[PDB]
Amino acid sequence: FCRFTAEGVQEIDYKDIATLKNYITESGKIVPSRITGTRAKYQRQLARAIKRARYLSLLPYTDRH
Amino acid sequence: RKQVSDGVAHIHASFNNTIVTITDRQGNALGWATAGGSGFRGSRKSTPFAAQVAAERCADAVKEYGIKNLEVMVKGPGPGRESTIRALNAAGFRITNITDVTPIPHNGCRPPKKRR
Amino acid sequence: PRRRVIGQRKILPDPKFGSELLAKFVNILMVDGKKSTAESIVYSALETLAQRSGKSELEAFEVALENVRPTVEVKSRRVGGSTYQVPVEVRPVRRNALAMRWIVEAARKRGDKSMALRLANELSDAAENKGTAVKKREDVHRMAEANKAFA
Amino acid sequence: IKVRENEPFDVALRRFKRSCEKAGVLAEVRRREFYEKPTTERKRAKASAVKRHAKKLARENARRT
RNA sequence: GCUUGAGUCUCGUAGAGGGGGGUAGAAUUCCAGGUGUAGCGGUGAAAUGCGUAGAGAUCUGGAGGAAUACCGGUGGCGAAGGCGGCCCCCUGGACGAAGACUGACGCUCAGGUGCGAAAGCGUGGGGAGCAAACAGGAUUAGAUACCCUGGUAGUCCACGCCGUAAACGAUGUCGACUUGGAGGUUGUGCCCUUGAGGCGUGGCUUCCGGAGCUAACGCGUUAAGUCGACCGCCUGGGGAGUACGGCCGCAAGGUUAAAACUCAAAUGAAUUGACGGGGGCCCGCACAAGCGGUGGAGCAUGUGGUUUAAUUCGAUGCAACGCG
RNA sequence: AGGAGGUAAAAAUGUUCA
Structure with a gap:
């Protein structure tokens, strides 16, 4: 129902955890595109970023620390 | 005795049993009770009602420690899981927070093929 | 039955006093259609109970009825697998x-x-609830409460 | 994962459990590896889903309800 | 000689495409220690097994091997097989853009060469989980099966071999043409980004359907439609994809591939029923809830069996047996 | 309207021909 950088051209960044946390659930799981209404292309860039951020521990692999 | 104040209840609710273990905050166990320990053998062992008495028999047997309030960290699917936390709360304990620590792997090992 | 949910029939009260509980008791006792004998039996068993209790005739019956009156019984309602026993209220x-x-x-x-x-x-032994009739009640409860894991 | 409510709850109301995983995936790694059946139940999943929506846009016969 | 065939160069685009080397978290098992105590585990139930030498549960730490949750979707890429945590290095292909360039170098292709899931094989490692074989416990009339507790090869890694799959959209490859609709996915041009866009122009792909085609089912611009080019293959069922021989292979085998004999059928799609330890719905003393009985006794009575000179004959699941 | 948790141990065989 809502869109993103498809109209406002820009790239996803693994460092920007401000917006990256808005695309994952608080339980440390990536939310599917069927709910967020994200374009398939950006979802892939999104997922790559989430996985990179998790490696740099800027995001939880799971909320249960 | 040692008189502890706060603790945490570990509820291992699996498909056949629902072993409940009340430990302290550091993890050291104090007392425990199971569905299969209070009788209930066989088909009645894997039942939420058996989980009720498991909680009741674990509600006591920890009286000497006198736990005021405790947390609940349930684990496994089990037929209880939510009926056992009810009997533990209605027993007279103060439930601060309930958490779920079911151990789901990220495709770690190859599960069984059993059950045809 | 399958579709028939028709109401029951209205029975007549006993010819001694208005109490259809007792009239129903007579019919349960009656065999071979001999009601005349049935009522004569329960009436004689009523005074012999009243003289052995010191209470009235009708009140000496309820105090012997709610002692053998169950609240839960066993119904065999399956789930698809084994037809296990399940306690249901009455x-x-x-x-x-x-x-x-x-x-x-x-x-x-x-x-x-x-x-x-x-x-x-x-009926006198049911007053002190220690007879074989009351025995049937507890054993029904013995298989009910001991197997009340199903709901 | 960790529901609290802190003071005026008096009950479970742990809706997150029926909403995240805690039943789906746990009763999925329960047994059966398959290695291939997921694919056939993958295609059968939407085969039923697309035929439901095809007739959802074609339920206007009359039916006289 | 020319360009719509085909190929090359410039700039970009998406991607589990392929090879090598590191790395991360969850989880399983195991090892040590603390707390703690009668079960744990398993199943339809139970037992074997594990446990009072103190398990399981729980907490902390450590050691390992394998697979990469969510993302993930009839999404993407690859010739096919097939390939997904993340990171770097080496590297292939496809596609779009506006032009230039070469000038039929094109299509197919017996033999030949290569790649080719899984299982299996050889050499050396590794070994958590899973698990042929095997063992025990059950179930059963029997159970060397289904179920349970364990468990070796194997599964994983490097280098070689095997060359087979329902290796399947069961559809060979290439090119041309022949009404539409609804979506996904990946570029780009134009217009006002005037706001989650609008109209075109390409690649790939999913589903539904017209003409036509087909035995029918169905296929349906990725055709099984309308044609052209080349290759492979079939000639009733069984025998048999077997024997013999050759070639290849360490082996298991693979590949090429008969005949005698024997049947008059084997086979496809679809139709009407009946049927299912298939689904949905509904009904009946069918069950359930109750009452009273049969079967045990004696006896009336009918039948079978046997006997007898003859024990007339028929009826003999339900629907014959106090029946004619 | 949108997605999940739960629902059957055991039951072999039927001469050839019409």
Whole structure:
């Protein structure tokens, strides 16, 4: 129902955890595109970023620390 | 005795049993009770009602420690899981927070093929 | 039945006083269509109970009825696999009905002299709830509460 | 994962459990590896889903309800 | 010689495409220690097994091997097989853009060469989980099966071999043409980004359907439609994809591939029923809830069996047996 | 309307021909 950088051209960044946390659930799981209404292309860039951020521990692999 | 104040209840609710273990905050166990320990053998062992008495028999047997309030960290699917936390709360304990620590792997090992 | 949910029939009260509970008790006792004998039996068992209790006739019956009156029974309602026993609550109209039958069949046991006297003995022994009729009640509860894991 | 409510709850109301995983995936790694059946139940999943929506846009016969 | 065939160069685009080397978290098992105590585990139930030498549960730490949750979707890429945590290095292909360039170098292709899931094989490692074989416990009339507790090869890694799959959209490859609709996915041009866009122009792909085609089912611009080019293959069922021989292979085998004999059928799609330890719905003393009985006794009575000179003959699942 | 948790141990065989 809502869109993103498809109209406002820009790239996803693994460092920007401000917006990256808005695309994952608080339980440390990536939310599917069927709910967020994200374009398939950006979802892939999104997922790559989430996985990179998790490696740099800027995001939880799971909320249960 | 040692008189502890706060603790945490570990509820291992699996498909056949629902072993409940009340430990302290550091993890050291104090007392425990199971569905299969209070009788209930066989088909009645894997039942939420058996989980009720498991909680009741674990509600006591920890009286000497006198736990005021405790947390609940349930684990496994089990037929209880939510009926056992009810009997533990209605027993007279103060439930601060309930958490779920079911151990789901990220495709770690190859599960069984059993059950045809 | 399958579709028939028609109501029951209205029975007449006993010809001694207005109390259809007792009239129903007579019919449960009656065999071979001999109602004349049936009422004569329960009436004689009523005074013999009243003189052996010191209470009234009708009140000495309820205090011997709610002692053998169950609240939970066993129904065999399966889930698809094994048809395990499941405890279910009883409706009030079946409550005393199940109770009256039990004290009657207990009268068929323990042969003293005459069943008029015999059921009077069982109604008296039901007052202190320590007879074979009340035994049927607890054992039903023994398989109910001990297997009340199903709901 | 960790529901609290802190003071005026008096009950479970742990809706997150029926909403995240805690039943789906746990009763999925329960047994059966398959290695291939997921694919056939993958295609059968939407085969039923697309035929439901095809007739959802074609339920206007009359039916006289 | 020319360009719509085909190929090359410039700039970009998406991607589990392929090879090598590191790395991360969850989880399983195991090892040590603390707390703690009668079960744990398993199943339809139970037992074997594990446990009072103190398990399981729980907490902390450590050691390992394998697979990468969510993302993930009839999404993407690859010739096919097939390939997904993340990171770097080496590297292939496809596609779009506006032009230039070469000038039929094109299509197919017996033999030949290569790649080719899984299982299996050889050499050396590794070994958590899972698990042929095997063992025990059950179930059963029997159970060397289904179920349970364990468990070796194997599964994983490097280098070689095997060359087979329902290796399947069961559809060979290439090119041309022949009404539409609804979506996904990946570029780009134009217009006002005037706001989650609008109209075109390409690649790939999913589903539904017209003409036509087909035995029918169905296929349906990725055709099984309308044609052209080349290759492979079939000639009733069984025998048999077997024997014999050759070639290849360490082996298991693979590949090429008969005949005698024997049947008059084997086979496809679809139709009407009946049927299912298939689904949905509904009904009946069918069950359930109750009452009273049969079967045990004696006897009336009918039948079978046997006997007898003859024990007339028929009826003999339900629907024969106090029946004619 | 949108997605999940739960629902059957055991039951072999039927001469050839019409």
